[PDB]
Amino acid sequence: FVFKVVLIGESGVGKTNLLSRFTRNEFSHDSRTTIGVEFSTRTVMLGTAAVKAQIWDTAGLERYRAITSAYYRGAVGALLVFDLTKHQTYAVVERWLKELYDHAEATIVVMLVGNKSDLSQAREVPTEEARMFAENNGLLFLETSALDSTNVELAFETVLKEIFAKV
Amino acid sequence: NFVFKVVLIGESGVGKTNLLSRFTRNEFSHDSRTTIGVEFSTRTVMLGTAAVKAQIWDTAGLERYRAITSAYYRGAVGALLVFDLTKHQTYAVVERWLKELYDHAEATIVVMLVGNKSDLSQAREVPTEEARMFAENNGLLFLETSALDSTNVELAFETVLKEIFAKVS
Amino acid sequence: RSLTYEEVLQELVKHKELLRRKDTHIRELEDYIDNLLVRVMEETPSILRVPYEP
Amino acid sequence: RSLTYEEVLQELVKHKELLRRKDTHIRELEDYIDNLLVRVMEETPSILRVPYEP
Numbered sequence: 001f002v003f004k005v006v007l008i009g010e011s012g013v014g015k016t017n018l019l020s021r022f023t024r025n026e027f028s029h030d031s032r033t034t035i036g037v038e039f040s041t042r043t044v045m046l047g048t049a050a051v052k053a054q055i056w057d058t059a060g061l062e063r064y065r066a067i068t069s070a071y072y073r074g075a076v077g078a079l080l081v082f083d084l085t086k087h088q089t090y091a092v093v094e095r096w097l098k099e100l101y102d103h104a105e106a107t108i109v110v111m112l113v114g115n116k117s118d119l120s121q122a123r124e125v126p127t128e129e130a131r132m133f134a135e136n137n138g139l140l141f142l143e144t145s146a147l148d149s150t151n152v153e154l155a156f157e158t159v160l161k162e163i164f165a166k167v
Numbered sequence: 168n169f170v171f172k173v174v175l176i177g178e179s180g181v182g183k184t185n186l187l188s189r190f191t192r193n194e195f196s197h198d199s200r201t202t203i204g205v206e207f208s209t210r211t212v213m214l215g216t217a218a219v220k221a222q223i224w225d226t227a228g229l230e231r232y233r234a235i236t237s238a239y240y241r242g243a244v245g246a247l248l249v250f251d252l253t254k255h256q257t258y259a260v261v262e263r264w265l266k267e268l269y270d271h272a273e274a275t276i277v278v279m280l281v282g283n284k285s286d287l288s289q290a291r292e293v294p295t296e297e298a299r300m301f302a303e304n305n306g307l308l309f310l311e312t313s314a315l316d317s318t319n320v321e322l323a324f325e326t327v328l329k330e331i332f333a334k335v336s
Numbered sequence: 337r338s339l340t341y342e343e344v345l346q347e348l349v350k351h352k353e354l355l356r357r358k359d360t361h362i363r364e365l366e367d368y369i370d371n372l373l374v375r376v377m378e379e380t381p382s383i384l385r386v387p388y389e390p
Numbered sequence: 391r392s393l394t395y396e397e398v399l400q401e402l403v404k405h406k407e408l409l410r411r412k413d414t415h416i417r418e419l420e421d422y423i424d425n426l427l428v429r430v431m432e433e434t435p436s437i438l439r440v441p442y443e444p
């Protein structure tokens with residue numbers, strides 16, 4: 001099993017560090033906006049099945065780009081990430097969900113992720129508002145920190161499990 | 168049959184991209200933008216009884232180190248080193264271009280020095296005889312071309328292919 | 337020496353035009369990248385792997 | 391509003407700073423392009439053909 005998973009959401013929310021945390025257990029306090037498109041992999045054992053996650057990443061830019069179709073093409077999973085310290089990143093989440101469904105295949109498993117949980121003091125999005133939006137739209141929901149690690153394995157592994165349950 | 172890799176080299180603005188489009192596509196553009204990246208186009212001629220494909224590469228004429236330089240020259244059997252005959256500076260730097268060429272290709276690669284933009288010759292700054300003489304003294308072919316009105320564009324690339332072919336057989 | 341108001345204002349005007357040209361060329365580079373990546377993603381997506389494994 | 395000398399100069403300093411960041415970004419984009427093309431040229435050079443044949 002190889003499951004293509006995409007990372008979507010605003011610039012700055014932590015997509016690239018969630019990728020590097022999950023796939024290499026590495027984090028960079030410095031990272032700049034991503035150029036182009038890349039992917040990294042991690043393979044887990046689910047029951048008795050080896051499952052490779054092939055997780056794609058690009059800058060969270062709202063404008064039209066040529067790569068958008070091919071980015072979403074064949075994806076069976078998505079993490080739609082906002083920064084829980086930045087309310088603008090959450091407000092705009094219905095717009096990303098719009099894009100996902102325009103390009104994504106029908107059976108895509110979607111998890112809404114509020115990243116930067118380690119910055120609880122600068123929080124601008126209540127867990128509750130985000131959970132309910134997720135529940136209303138049939139999306140999974142978690143809060144993570146790529147920085148300290150909280151829920152990062154759980155977030156990617158829960159998506160892979162739900163994909164695996166379907167396939 | 169044969170595939171000969173040929174590179175275009177020389178200062179930004181001399182007409183490399185337009186010589187390539189004029190030969191391989193019979194197209195020319197007034198757009199003055201420097202080439203981004205690296206591209207190649209092909210044209211196949213018959214030399215004697217052989218079908219010979221010219222695979223001609225293009226990139227911007229930048230002096231600075233670039234990661235793509237080695238792979239750009241790798242496997243090349245010919246080079247057109249181009250200048251703008253209306254801009255003396257583009258000619259003055261020809262030997263720096265040859266130096267770079269011979270850091271990446273064998274010393275006896277077939278090379279044509281090309282003085283491009285001949286339809287602008289009312290504003291010539293490089294004498295035909297002077298560049299012809301330089302080409303002769305350095306073992307280079309030479310021609311003046313115009314990618315805009317086509318003058319000598321076919322001859323320039325077909326002469327390079329003919330020499331490579333002679334040398335290879 | 338101290339620049340006059342007009343000298344400072346000319347520098348600002350010049351910088352505004354340079355900014356416009358730089359923004360134009362950034363989008364040209366970004367558009368090149370995107371067009372190239374469409375071809376890569378479709379033909380040989382392994383090139384996009386991090387870390388790269390030839 | 392007629393900007394004062396200090397307001398013009400501040401607008402200039404801000405542009406100068408914007409320019410430095412735009413220049414760094416341009417070179418980041420150029421380096422990305424060069425590094426990607428190296429791999430394309432090694433593995434699948436036909437991607438660079440003009441006109442393109444998939």
Ligand SMILES: Nc1nc2c(ncn2[C@@H]2O[C@H](COP(=O)(O)OP(=O)(O)NP(=O)(O)O)[C@@H](O)[C@H]2O)c(=O)[nH]1
Nearest residue numbers: 011012013014015016017029031033034060146147
């Ligand atoms: N405190 C904290 N910082 C984080 C966390 N995740 C990412 N960051 C920091 O947030 C900044 C942006 O992270 P990055 O992963 O590059 O964001 P991105 O979503 O990929 N941005 P873009 O879409 O432009 O490429 C970085 O300075 C990074 O170190 C986190 O969980 N906690």
Ligand SMILES: Nc1nc2c(ncn2[C@@H]2O[C@H](COP(=O)(O)OP(=O)(O)NP(=O)(O)O)[C@@H](O)[C@H]2O)c(=O)[nH]1
Nearest residue numbers: 179180181182183184185197201202227228314315
């Ligand atoms: N009149 C005339 N103009 C030409 C001729 N060749 C090229 N040009 C024009 O000269 C300018 C630059 O040509 P171009 O082919 O882009 O040059 P280049 O050598 O590829 N530049 P770079 O190395 O930066 O990519 C363009 O505006 C082009 O239309 C020519 O033979 N005659």
Ligand SMILES: [Mg+2]
Nearest residue numbers: 015016033034
């Ligand atoms: Mg990123």
Ligand SMILES: [Mg+2]
Nearest residue numbers: 183184201202
């Ligand atoms: Mg060019």
